[PDB]
């Protein structure tokens, strides 16, 4: 999983504060960081199906949070996907 | 850094080579900004069963804080040293300083 | 199961000490268990059955 330090950085960049761990932007940024990190794992470990199920849950959760944010605030949504480099 | 507990046991004829090996292996670790929390030379003990005809071996314990690569490097040294008949490297959660049984 | 026959001990006492060491170690039951292959399904069924009658 993501380190305490790497997590704390992401909360600082995308959150309102260090305490603001709940915001959709932070949550999406955290999921994105771990999805990107795990690409190296699954490149090496192609038949780690059990861990991949956890990755696909991260992907699905991110998709649901982005869809929530899109319909709640299109502008924040647009900013976020630019910063994180997501298609949608 | 990660905390490791290392046991290795040396061929009883190379018991006199062990002080040089200990100071060499600790030199490898200290050079990587690593720490030595414990270092016990248990000396020649009776083996519970024969390992490669031998009935005794010279045990050395050391608890170490280091990067994983220098530990990986130290395991390859044990592999390719015929004096080192057997070794075990174990992750520990915390540092261990206090003396063993 | 390894008995050293102790001094001024008769042979029956030596031999029953060997018998008791064997039954404690469980040699013959382990041999009889390993004579034939038991499918894992059969093993689990046996384990469950023993448990249901233990309780």
């Amino acid at each position: 999983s993501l380190s305490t330090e790497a997590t704390a950085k992401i909360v600082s960049e995308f959150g309102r504060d260090a305490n603001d761990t709940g915001s959709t932007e932070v949550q999406v940024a955290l999921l994105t960081a771990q999805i990107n990190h795990l690409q190296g794992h699954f490149a090496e470990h192609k038949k780690d199906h059990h861990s991949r199920r956890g990755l696909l849950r991260m992907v699905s959760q991110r998709r649901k949070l982005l869809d929530y944010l899109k319909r709640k605030d299109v502008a924040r949504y647009t900013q976020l996907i630019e910063r994180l480099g997501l298609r949608r | 850094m990660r905390h490791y507990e290392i046991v290795f046991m040396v061929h009883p004829d190379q018991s006199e080579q062990v002080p040089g090996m200990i100071e060499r292996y600790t030199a490898a670790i200290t050079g990587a900004e690593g720490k030595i929390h414990r270092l016990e030379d248990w000396g020649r003990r009776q083996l519970a069963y024969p390992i490669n005809k031998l009935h005794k071996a010279h045990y050395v314990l050391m608890n170490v804080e280091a990067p994983q690569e220098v530990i990986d490097e130290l395991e390859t040294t044990f592999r390719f040293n015929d004096a080192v008949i057997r070794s075990m490297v174990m992750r520990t959660k915390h540092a261990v300083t206090e003396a063993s049984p | 199961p390894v008995i050293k026959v102790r001094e001024n001990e008769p042979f029956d006492v030596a031999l029953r000490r060997f018998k008791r060491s064997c039954e404690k170690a469980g040699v013959l039951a382990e041999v009889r268990r390993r004579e034939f292959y038991e499918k894992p399904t059969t093993e689990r069924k046996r384990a469950k059955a023993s448990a249901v009658k233990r309780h």
């Binding site: - | 083996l47 069963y49 024969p50 314990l61 063993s100 049984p101 | 199961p1 390894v2 170690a25």
Partner: protein, 64 residues
Amino acid sequence: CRFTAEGVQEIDYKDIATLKNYITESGKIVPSRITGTRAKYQRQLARAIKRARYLSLLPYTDRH
């Protein structure tokens, strides 16, 4: 259970004097139903014994 009573956290593979209480003379690990070890400590004990056996601090069997 001694390990619970005596406040033990991690059973040490190096503590051969302790481990010898939980093996038979054949070298086999004694069941928890005999010794009254708690399940959590029985698992630690089994691991400790298997490490000790690897390092030839304990025998696997009474006939090497």
